[PDB]
Amino acid sequence: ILTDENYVDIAEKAILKLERNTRNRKNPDAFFLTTSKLRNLLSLTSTLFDESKVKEYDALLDRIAYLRVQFVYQAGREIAVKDLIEKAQILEALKEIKDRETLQRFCRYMEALVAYFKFYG
């Protein structure tokens, strides 16, 4: 669940909760998760954040239903994304998306995830 006063803090704590590379210390504390894997998921949360401000929530919901599909598939293959949807719980934040403000709160939550994934590099 995402309140409007904690979701950036949840996203920061979850990016710090991503387990890191204990293997070779050529720049250690890197992630198993790569930027492109996470950024393909922001690539489709941030084109619903654009359309939500223009369209209506009853006109977007095929895309909003497909967000769960793509987050489950991308966290199938390549388990370092399964790590992220467990630590930064997405599939439970996606079932509770019934309002357009809740939709945009989830999209900005995903942006906070990528912001702190880039910050802690």
Binding site: R39, L42, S43, T45, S46, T47, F49, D50, E51, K53, V54, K55, R108, E111, V114, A115
Partner: protein, 217 residues
């Protein structure tokens, strides 16, 4: 009864849909870097009359000046009466009123099956040395979109020849927007406005626009 006011009305059709830029605010993270200007009540693209007026004034400034002007104040009197002039006292308050342009075929684009009314143009730049790419996302209006253009012209008792003299200038300035661009990032697409159904009618009466609607072919 020498005071009239006519309405040049037309349809702005787009080709290479235009990016009249909106806020330069901080893009979200992966959202649109540069958006278009939007109507706040329907969230559809508009074309402001400031953008039309300024673009048409700089285009007509290349045809009708006889000398290069450093300011809009230093324009010729055949443009300073139409688009106004702050410094010349006769040419304050005149003469054209460029109303904003709003979508006229939202339902026709709905029947054409398009999802949005703004496409998003994904672009990048390649650094000359090192060949790195830096991406861009630009909202622009979709291609066959159409905007109601109205261009109120005032006719005061003073002119008596300048009315048919200025109609030629307005028609030429609408012909130069079709060859140049509008708003946009025009050297890279983004322009190519067509004007269809050019017709004028006196919305404040007692003037004959028969010869001008003949003059607009």
């Amino acid at each position: 009864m020498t005071f009239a006011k006519i309405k040049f009305s037309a349809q702005i059709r787009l080709e290479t849909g235009l990016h009249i830029g909106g806020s330069d605010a901080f893009a979200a993270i992966g959202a649109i870097n540069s958006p278009v200007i939007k109507d706040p009540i329907t969230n559809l693209p508009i074309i402001p009359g400031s953008s039309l007026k300024g673009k048409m004034r700089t285009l007509l400034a290349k045809v009708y000046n006889e000398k290069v002007a450093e300011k809009p104040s230093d324009d010729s009197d055949i443009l300073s009466r139409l688009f106004g002039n702050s410094k010349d006292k006769r040419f304050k308050m005149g003469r054209l009123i460029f109303r904003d342009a709003f979508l006229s075929n939202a339902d026709e684009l709905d029947s054409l099956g398009v999802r949005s009314y703004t496409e998003v143009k994904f672009e990048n730049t390649i650094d000359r040395i090192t060949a790195e790419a830096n991406p861009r996302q630009i909202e622009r209006a979709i291609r066959n979109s159409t905007f109601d253009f109205e261009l109120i012209y005032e006719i005061t008792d003073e002119n008596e020849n300048q009315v048919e003299e200025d109609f030629k200038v307005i028609r030429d300035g609408l012909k130069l927007l079709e060859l140049d661009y509008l708003g946009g990032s025009g050297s890279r697409g983004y322009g190519k406005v067509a004007f269809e159904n050019l017709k004028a009618t006196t919305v404040f009466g007692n003037y004959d626009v028969k010869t001008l609607n003949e003059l607009l072919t």
